[PDB]
Design a protein around this ligand. Structure first.
Ligand SMILES: [Cl-]
Ligand SMILES: [Cl-]
Ligand code: NA
Length: 129
């Protein structure tokens, strides 16, 4: 599924991401835009052989099991394929664990490089939430 921008904003809000750990909704939409272009089926292979999955590009090195990242952890206790569903619940629940691990949203490179310090509000403007 390729979400529309307001459609994704509303789904994230329903799932408790608005102001989660002090990050307003537009941060999460911005991060999703640049990580996956709002596509739940996005995958990308990293240099270390890990892979990033789903709309928030969550890494198999630490967060999910894909059976092909030797020595990896599965901190979200999920198969990585679950991160690719049209239902974003599993991605949101796992992202909540990531952003709480001390490093906030800096875990997402695209957020750090393309969202942090910008007017993220603009990612939710015009949306009925
Ligand atoms: Cl915002
Ligand atoms: Cl980047
Ligand atoms: Na893993």
């Amino acid at each position: 599924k390729v979400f529309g921008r307001c459609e994704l904003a509303a789904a994230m809000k329903r799932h408790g991401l608005d102001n989660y750990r002090g990050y307003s909704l537009g941060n999460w939409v911005c991060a999703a835009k640049f990580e996956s272009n709002f596509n739940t089926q996005a995958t990308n292979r990293n240099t270390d052989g890990s892979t990033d999955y789903g709309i928030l590009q969550i890494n198999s090195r630490w967060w999910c099991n894909d059976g092909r990242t030797p020595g990896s952890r599965n901190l979200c206790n999920i198969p990585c394929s679950a991160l690719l569903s049209s239902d974003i619940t599993a991605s949101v629940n796992c992202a909540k664990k990531i952003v709480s691990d001390g490093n906030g949203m800096n875990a997402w490179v695209a957020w750090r490089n393309r969202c942090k310090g910008t007017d993220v509000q603009a990612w939710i403007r015009g949306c009925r939430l």
